[PDB]
From a paper:
To investigate the structural basis for [name]-[name] regulation by ceramide, we determined the structure of the [name]-[name] complex in the presence of excess C6-ceramide using single-particle cryo-EM. The structure of the monomeric [name]-[name] complex was resolved at an overall resolution of 2.9 Å. Compared to the cryo-EM map of the monomeric [name]-[name]* complex we previously reported, several extra well-ordered lipid-like densities could be resolved between [name] and [name] in the cytosolic membrane leaflet. While the N-terminus of [name]* was not resolved in the [name]-[name]* structure, the N-terminus of [name] could be well resolved in the updated maps. Among the well-ordered lipid-like densities, the shape and size of one lipid-like density are consistent with a C6-ceramide molecule, showing one small polar head contiguous with two acyl chains. Close to the C6-ceramide density, we could observe two additional lipid-like densities, which might result from the acyl chains of phospholipids, sphingolipids, or other lipidic species. An alternative explanation for the two presumable acyl-chain densities is that they might arise from the average of C6-ceramide and endogenous bound long-chain ceramide (such as C24-ceramide). In the ceramide binding site, the polar head of ceramide makes five potential hydrogen bonds with the surrounding residues, including the side chain groups of Asn13 and His85 in [name], Tyr122 in [name], and the main chain group of Phe63 in [name] (left). The two aliphatic chains of ceramide are enclosed by numerous hydrophobic residues from both [name] and [name].
The ORM/[name] family proteins function as regulatory subunits of the serine palmitoyltransferase ([name]) complex, which is the initiating and rate-limiting enzyme in sphingolipid biosynthesis. In humans, the heterotrimeric [name] core enzymatic complex, composed of [name], [name] or SPTLC3, and [name] or SPTssb, catalyzes the first and rate-limiting step of de novo sphingolipid biosynthesis by condensation of serine and palmitoyl-CoA to generate 3-keto-dihydrosphingosine (3-KDS). As a critical mechanism for the homeostatic regulation of sphingolipid production, [name] activity is inhibited in response to elevated cellular sphingolipid levels in an ORM/[name]-dependent manner. In this work, we demonstrate that ceramide binds directly with and inhibits the human [name]-[name] complexes, a process that is important for establishing cellular sphingolipid homeostasis.
Author numbering:
A (entry chain D): 1 to 153
B (entry chain C): 9 to 56
C (entry chain A): 51 to 473
D (entry chain B): 45 to 543
E (entry chain E): 8 to 50
Write the structure that this text describes.
C-alpha cells in the first residue's frame, strides 16, 4: 500500500536486494531455470549450458539496466524517474555488499559454461559477447550515461 | 480423505500466490507446470 | 588524522543557539482578542457588545436552527469523533453521503473531502506535479497554495497579478525551449494555478481569456475557489457560473467547507480520472483521521438549504455593492477590491515609510472603532515566510444578517475615526 | 533501581522486547509469490494493448489527447496489478459508533474489485479490533457526550475565523490551561488537526543550517514537517543508542556538509509507542544522551498518551522521568480521548513564540466548540475531578487486557512484535497471498482487523495489527482468541521456532 | 560416462581463451577488496 506506512523509507526499491534470503533465493532461480531446459529431450548438454547463460544475462539486463523508475508512487517527488534499478541500488553508493554479489555471479556462471561446452569456438563468441553486455553497465564510470542518447526519456 | 486432499490444494494456492488470480490465469499457470513436469519424466526414462 | 584528545575538546567548545529567539514585547500580534460566546451577528469581544464585520460566514448558517438540529441527530447516533484514518474503519456512511451530495451540487463527476481546510490544496497540488514539471502561478496566491507548491519540488514561475499579457509572455518562452530539446518536451507537464476571488486583493480572475490560452499552449488549469464557492453565480456555484464556462474545462476545483458552509474541512471536485488518484496519494488524506460525523451532517443541511432557495445569493450581492459604494469617500484610506466581492480590504494611502508604523496606525483605528459597536480586524501575514508580502490593511466582511441601517451606520463610523487619526 | 546502562540511563522496571526474524524456508517462499505476481502483471499490460479493451477504467477527454499524459504509466503498476486484487480489505464503511462492536455494510464486487455495490444488509456485531479506542471513550451515551450537545446548542458546529483574528473564543483558553496541568508543563497550545500539528510547527523551529536526527520508523507527518523546514536530515537505526550516539558525535566534530562550519542547533525527533511496530522508545537513554551533547528533544506521544503510565500521562510517567527534560511535547486527541485535534506543550517561552509564528495560528481555522467540550470532559475524568471512579478503572483495565492477550497468543505459536506493555499487537504473516486471506477469514468469523502489505513495510514483513481497548471484556477477548486460533491453523500462521 | 573428455579438452584450450578467463579472475580479486565510496559528491 502507501509507501511510508510502516517505514520512513522514501524509496523502498533501494533496499530490496539487501533483504534476508534474496541471495539464496536468486541462486535457486538460476538453478531452476537450468533444470527445465535440461529436461528438453532433443537438445545436447553444450546447447543447454549456452541457453542457460544467454537467457539469464538477457533477463538480468532488462530488469537491472533497462526498466527505469519505480512501480509505486513515492513521497520523494519522482527523483528516481530516469534511473535504472542498478543506479538506484543503495542510493548510488558504489561497491556495497550487494553490488559485489551481482557483479560476481555472472562471471562464475561463465566459467561453468566454458568448461561444459568444451571450449568450443562458436560457443565462445556467443557467451563472451553476452557476458560483456552485462558487465559494462556495472562499471562505476557508466553511472547515468546513455550511449547515443538511447533509453533516455 | 477427500476433505484433507482438498486442503492440500488450498496450501498450494497460498504459497504460489495463485489464490489472488482470475480463473483463466490459474489455468495458464497450471498448464505449463504439468507440461514441464510431464516432459521431465519422459526425459528421465530415456537417459536413466 | 583527528586524534582522540582533540575530538573530545571539540565537543566541549560547541554551544547551540536557543530553540526560540526572544526580543519580543512589541510584536503587533500576541494579544488574541477573547470572544465570550458564539461569534454570531451580535458578539461580545473583549467584554463589549458590537456587530462584527470580521467573521467569514456570508449566508448566515452558523446559528441556523435547522443546521444546529441536524448535527445533533448525528451526535446521538454516532458519538463525537471517528477513530481511524479513513483507510481502516474510518469511513462512515455520512462521509459517502456528503461526497455524493457535493458532486450533484457542482454538477461534476466526483468529489473528495478532507478534514482540514488548509490541507486540501496543500495535499492536492503535490499529488499531480513532480520534480520535472512547470507550474505558472499568479503572484497573489494565498499561503496554502505556496506550501503546496513548495512540497512539490517543481519549477515555479510567477506572473503579474491578473494580466494575461504577462502569462502569455512566459508561455512563449517555454515554447522556445521546446525546439531546443523536443525529446524532453514530451515528458514535462504544464500547470496553471489560479484562483477566483483572491483573498489577498479582493479581485476576480479573468477565466474566459485564461481558458483560451489553455488549449493553445497545452497546459492544465487548477482552480482554487475557496472564497467564491457559495457566493458568486446565480446558484452559488462559483466563478465558473459567473461567466458561463463549461465545468469540464477546469480539471480540478478545490474549496473549503469553512466559509459559506459554516463548518470544518475542505473538498476537491472534478472528473473521476483525476479525482480517484488522490485517494491513494493525498498525504493528508491517507495518514490522518477523518472528519467527525457531526461536522459532516452540518454541511449536508447547509447544502440542502442553499439548494432549497437560490435567492439568498441575490441579497448578498446587492448589499455588497452598497457598502463598497459608501466607502469611496474616506480621505486617507483607499478601498482595494471588486464590487462583487464580500471580503474586500481597506488599505492605507501614502504609507509613512516603515511597516511597523503602518501597522500601529491601522491598529489605532481598529481599537478606536470597536469602542463604538463595530468589530473589525486587520489581515495577518507571516512576514518572513512569504513570497510577496501584501501591505497592511483592515479586512471588511459582509453577510446577509447585517441590515441596511447597520451597513450605512458602519460605513460612517469608519470615516469619522479615520479622518481624526490620519491627519 | 533495576539496572543502569552506560549511556547514563537508569531503568526502574525490566524493559524487555522481542523481534524474532523470519525462518529461512518461509522467507524464500514469499519471493515466489511476488515473482509470480510481477510476471503475471507484465502479461496484463501487454494484453491491454492490442487486445482487451478493459472498458471500465477512466480515461482522458477526447479534446485533450494532445496534452502530455497526466500520469506516469509505470508508477501505479502495483496499484492496478497487486492492490486492486485484494482491495476489499480496507475501505469498509461502518454505520454505528465504533467501539468493541461495530456495524459493517456488506458489499460485493462482480469484476474483481474494479467496481463495488452495496447489497443492502448489515453485519450486526463485529468485534472491533482495528480502531484506536484505548480507554473506550468512544460512546454515544454517558455524561461525556451529554455535555457536548449542550455546547452545540449555543455555539454552532464550527467557527468562521482564525486565532489571530476573531476566531479565539473563551472555550479555547479553557482547554489550554487544562492541558498544561494534565501534562504537567508550563504552557500548551491546541491546533485542530493531528497531522497538521507536526507539519505546520516543525518548520517554525528549525531552518537552513540546522540538523534533524530522525528515527528509522517515524510517522509520515513527522517526516513531511522536516522536509518543509529546509534543514538536513539523517536517520538512525530504530531504538539503537549506539547508532544515535555515533551520529550525534560525528555531527559536532565534522560540522556542516560542504562549508564545514558548526551547526546552529541539533534536534532529535522520536516518538512514544510506535503503532505498526508495537515498541516503546528508550527515554532514559535518549534523555541522558541529549544532555551530554546539548541537543534538543521533540517527543510525539500520540499513541502513548492515556494508554501508558499508571494514571495515563504518557510515556514520561511510564519510565518515572520528569516532564521538564523534554523540550517539545506533541500529541493528539483522537486515539484515547475520542475526539479530534492536536496539541504542543512546553515552556512559557516556546508557547509564546508559537502563538505568533506558527502557520496554523494565522492561516487555518480553529477547533470546533463541540469537539473542544468533549476533550475537556474526558480529560477531567482521567484526573478524577468528576468525583467518579470511571477513570481509574478504564486505565487499569487496559493493562490487564494487554497482558492476557499478548501472553495467550505467544503460547499458541505466533510471531508477535514489540514490547509486552504495548496495547498494539502486530501479528506476522509473510506471504503476499495471506494478506488477502487473513482479512476475509476474520470478517467471515465476525472479526475486523487491519492488514499491511509490501510497499507500506519491507518485502518480508507483511503483518496484521490488533489495537486493544479497555472496552473489550473477558468474554469478547475469549471469543476473539478462539477464532484467531482456528484461522491460524487453517492458513498455517504459527511460524514461531523458539516457542 | 562422459567426464574425461571435458578435462582432456581443457588442456588443449586455445591460448586466447585461457588468457581471458585468467584476466577475469584478477578482476574478482580486485573488486573483492574495495571500499564503498559514495560516487562523486560536492567536490
Ligand atoms: C515459478 C516462478 C518463480 C519466480 C519466477 C519470477 C522471477 C522473475 C521476477 C522478476 C523480479 C524483478 C527483479 C527486479 C525488478 C525491478 O525492476 C523492480 C522495479 O524496478 N523492482 C521490484 O519491484 C522488485 C520487487 C521484488 C520482487 C521479487
Ligand atoms: C527471464 C527471467 C529471468 C531469468 C531467471 C534467472 C535470473 C535472471 C532474472 C534476474 C536477474 C537479475 C535481476
Ligand atoms: C524450496 C524451493 C522452492 C523453489 C524456489 C526457487 C525459485 C524461487 C525464485 C523466486 C524468484 C526470485 C526473485 C529474486 C530475483 C531478483
Ligand atoms: C505524528 C502523528 N501525526 C498524525 C497522526 C494522525 O492524525 P490524527 O491525529 O488526525 O489522527 C498520528 C497517528 C501521528 O502519530
Amino acid at each position: 500500500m502507501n509507501v511510508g506506512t510502516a517505514h520512513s523509507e522514501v524509496n523502498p526499491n533501494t533496499r530490496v536486494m539487501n533483504s534476508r534470503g534474496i541471495w539464496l533465493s536468486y541462486v535457486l532461480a538460476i538453478g531452476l531455470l537450468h533444470i527445465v531446459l535440461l529436461s528438453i529431450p532433443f537438445v545436447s548438454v553444450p546447447v543447454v549450458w549456452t541457453l542457460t547463460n544467454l537467457i539469464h544475462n538477457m533477463g538480468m539486463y532488462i530488469f537491472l539496466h533497462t526498466v527505469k523508475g519505480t512501480p509505486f508512487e513515492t513521497p520523494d517527488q519522482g527523483k528516481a524517474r530516469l534511473l535504472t534499478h542498478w543506479e538506484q541500488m543503495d542510493y548510488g553508493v558504489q561497491f556495497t555488499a550487494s553490488r559485489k554479489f551481482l557483479t560476481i555471479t555472472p562471471i562464475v556462471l561463465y566459467f561453468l559454461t566454458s568448461f561444459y561446452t568444451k571450449y568450443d569456438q562458436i560457443h565462445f563468441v556467443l557467451n563472451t559477447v553476452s557476458l560483456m553486455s552485462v558487465l559494462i553497465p556495472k562499471l562505476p564510470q557508466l553511472h547515468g550515461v546513455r550511449i547515443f542518447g538511447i533509453n533516455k526519456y | 480423505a477427500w476433505k484433507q486432499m482438498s486442503w492440500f490444494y488450498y496450501q498450494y494456492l497460498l504459497v504460489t500466490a495463485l489464490y489472488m488470480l482470475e480463473p483463466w490465469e490459474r489455468t495458464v499457470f497450471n498448464s505449463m507446470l504439468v507440461s514441464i513436469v510431464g516432459m521431465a519424466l519422459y526425459t528421465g526414462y530415456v537417459f536413466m | 588524522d583527528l586524534t582522540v584528545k582533540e575530538k573530545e575538546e571539540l565537543i566541549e567548545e560547541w554551544q547551540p543557539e536557543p530553540l526560540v529567539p526572544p526580543v519580543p514585547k512589541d510584536h503587533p500580534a500576541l494579544n488574541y482578542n477573547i470572544v465570550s460566546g458564539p461569534p454570531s451577528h451580535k458578539t461580545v469581544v473583549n467584554g463589549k457588545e458590537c456587530i462584527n464585520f470580521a467573521s467569514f460566514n456570508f449566508l448566515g448558517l452558523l446559528d441556523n436552527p435547522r443546521v444546529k438540529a441536524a448535527a445533533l441527530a448525528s451526535l446521538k447516533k454516532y458519538g463525537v469523533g471517528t477513530c481511524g484514518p479513513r483507510g481502516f474503519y474510518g469511513t462512515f456512511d455520512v462521509h459517502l453521503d456528503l461526497e455524493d451530495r457535493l458532486a450533484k451540487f457542482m454538477k461534476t463527476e466526483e468529489a473528495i473531502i478532507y478534514s482540514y481546510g488548509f490541507a486540501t490544496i496543500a495535499s492536492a497540488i503535490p499529488a499531480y506535479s513532480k520534480r520535472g514539471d512547470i507550474v505558472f502561478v499568479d503572484r497573489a496566491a494565498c499561503f496554502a497554495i505556496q506550501k503546496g507548491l513548495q512540497a512539490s519540488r517543481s519549477d515555479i514561475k510567477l506572473f503579474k497579478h491578473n494580466d494575461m499579457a504577462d502569462l502569455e509572455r512566459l508561455l512563449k518562452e517555454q515554447e522556445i525551449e521546446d525546439q531546443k530539446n523536443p525529446r524532453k518536451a514530451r515528458v514535462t507537464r504544464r500547470f496553471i494555478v489560479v484562483e477566483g476571488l483572491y483573498m489577498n486583493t479582493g479581485t476576480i480572475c479573468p477565466l474566459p481569456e485564461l481558458v483560451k490560452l489553455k488549449y493553445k499552449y497545452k497546459a492544465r488549469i487548477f482552480l482554487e475557489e475557496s472564497l467564491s464557492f457559495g457566493v458568486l453565480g446565480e446558484h452559488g456555484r462559483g466563478v465558473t457560473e459567473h461567466y458561463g464556462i463549461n465545468i469540464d474545462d477546469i480539471d480540478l476545483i478545490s474549496a473549503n467547507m469553512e466559509n459559506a458552509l459554516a463548518s470544518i474541512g475542505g473538498f476537491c471536485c472534478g472528473r473521476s480520472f483525476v479525482i480517484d488518484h488522490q485517494r491513494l496519494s493525498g498525504q493528508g488524506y491517507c495518514f490522518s483521521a477523518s472528519l467527525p460525523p457531526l461536522l459532516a451532517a452540518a454541511a449536508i443541511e447547509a447544502l440542502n438549504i442553499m439548494e432549497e432557495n437560490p435567492g439568498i445569493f441575490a441579497v448578498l450581492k446587492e448589499k455588497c455593492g452598497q457598502i463598497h459604494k459608501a466607502l469611496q469617500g474616506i480621505s486617507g484610506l483607499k478601498v482595494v477590491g471588486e464590487s462583487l466581492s464580500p471580503a474586500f480590504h481597506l488599505q492605507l494611502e501614502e504609507s509613512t515609510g516603515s511597516r511597523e508604523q503602518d501597522v500601529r496606525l491601522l491598529q489605532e483605528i481598529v481599537d478606536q472603532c470597536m469602542n463604538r459597536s463595530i468589530a473589525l480586524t486587520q489581515a495577518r501575514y507571516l512576514e518572513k515566510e512569504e513570497k510577496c508580502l501584501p501591505p497592511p490593511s483592515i479586512r471588511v466582511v459582509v453577510t446577509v444578517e447585517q441590515t441596511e441601517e447597520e451597513l450605512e451606520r458602519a460605513a460612517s463610523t469608519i470615516k469619522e475615526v479615520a479622518q481624526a487619526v490620519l491627519l | 533501581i533495576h539496572h543502569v546502562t552506560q549511556n547514563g540511563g537508569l531503568y526502574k522496571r525490566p524493559f524487555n522486547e522481542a523481534f524474532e526474524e523470519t525462518p529461512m524456508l518461509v522467507a524464500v517462499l514469499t519471493y515466489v509469490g511476488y515473482g509470480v505476481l510481477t510476471l503475471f502483471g507484465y502479461l496484463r499490460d501487454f494484453l491491454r494493448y492490442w487486445r482487451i479493451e478493459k472498458c471500465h477504467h477512466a480515461t482522458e477527454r477526447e479534446e485533450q489527447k494532445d496534452f502530455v499524459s497526466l500520469y506516469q504509466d509505470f508508477e501505479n503498476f502495483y496499484t492496478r496489478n497487486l492492490y486492486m486484487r485484494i482491495r476489499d480489505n480496507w475501505n469498509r464503511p461502518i454505520c454505528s459508533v465504533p467501539g468493541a462492536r461495530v456495524d459493517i455494510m456488506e458489499r460485493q464486487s462482480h469484476d474483481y474489485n474494479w467496481s463495488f455495490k452495496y447489497t443492502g444488509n448489515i453485519i450486526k456485531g463485529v468485534i472491533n479490533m482495528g480502531s484506536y479506542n484505548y480507554l473506550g471513550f468512544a460512546r454515544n451515551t454517558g455524561s461525556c457526550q451529554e455535555a457536548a450537545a449542550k455546547v452545540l446548542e449555543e455555539y454552532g458546529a464550527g467557527v468562521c475565523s482564525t486565532r489571530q483574528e476573531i476566531g479565539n473564543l473563551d472555550k479555547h483558553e479553557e482547554l489550554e490551561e487544562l492541558v498544561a496541568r494534565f501534562l504537567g508543563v508550563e504552557a500548551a497550545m491546541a491546533y485542530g488537526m493531528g497531522f497538521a500539528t507536526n507539519s505546520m510547527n516543525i518548520p517554525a523551529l528549525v531552518g537552513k543550517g540546522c540538523l534533524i536526527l530522525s528515527d528509522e520508523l517515524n510517522h509520515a507527518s513527522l517526516v513531511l514537517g522536516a522536509r518543509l523546514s529546509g534543514a538536513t536530515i539523517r536517520i538512525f537505526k530504530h531504538n539503537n543508542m549506539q547508532s544515535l550516539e555515533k551520529l550525534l558525535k560525528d555531527a559536532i566534530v565534522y560540522g556542516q556538509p560542504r562549508t564545514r562550519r558548526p551547526w546552529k542547533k541539533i534536534l532529535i525527533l522520536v516518538e512514544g509507542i510506535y503503532s505498526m511496530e508495537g515498541s516503546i522508545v528508550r527515554l532514559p537513554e535518549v534523555i541522558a544522551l541529549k544532555k551530554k551533547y546539548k541537543a534538543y528533544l521533540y517527543l510525539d506521544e500520540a499513541h502513548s498518551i492515556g494508554a501508558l503510565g499508571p494514571t495515563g500521562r504518557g510515556v514520561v510517567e511510564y519510565f518515572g522521568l520528569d516532564p521538564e527534560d523534554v523540550d517539545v511535547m506533541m500529541g493528539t486527541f483522537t486515539k484515547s480521548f475520542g475526539a479530534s485535534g492536536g496539541y504542543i506543550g512546553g515552556k512559557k517561552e516556546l508557547i509564546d513564540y508559537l502563538r505568533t509564528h506558527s502557520h496554523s495560528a494565522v492561516y487555518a481555522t480553529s477547533l470546533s466548540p463541540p469537539v473542544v467540550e468533549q476533550i475537556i470532559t474526558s480529560m477531567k475524568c482521567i484526573m478524577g475531578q468528576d468525583g467518579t471512579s470511571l477513570g481509574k478503572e478504564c486505565v487499569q483495565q487496559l493493562a490487564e487486557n494487554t497482558r492476557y492477550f499478548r501472553r495467550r497468543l505467544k503460547e499458541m505459536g505466533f510471531i508477535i512484535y514489540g514490547n509486552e506493555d504495548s496495547p498494539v499487537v502486530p501479528l506476522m504473516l509473510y506471504m503476499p497471498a495471506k494478506i488477502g486471506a487473513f482479512g476475509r477469514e476474520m470478517l467471515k468469523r465476525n472479526i475486523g482487523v487491519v492488514v499491511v502489505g509490501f510497499p507500506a513495510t519491507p518485502i518480508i514483513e507483511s503483518r496484521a495489527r490488533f489495537c486493544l481497548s479497555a472496552a473489550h471484556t473477558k468474554e469478547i477477548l475469549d471469543t476473539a482468541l478462539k477464532e484467531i486460533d482456528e484461522v491460524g491453523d487453517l492458513l498455517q500462521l504459527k511460524y514461531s521456532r523458539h516457542r | 560416462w562422459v567426464l574425461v573428455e571435458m578435462v582432456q579438452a581443457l588442456y588443449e584450450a586455445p591460448a586466447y581463451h585461457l588468457i581471458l578467463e585468467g584476466i577475469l579472475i584478477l578482476w574478482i580479486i580486485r573488486l573483492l577488496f574495495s571500499k564503498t565510496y559514495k560516487l562523486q559528491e560536492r567536490s
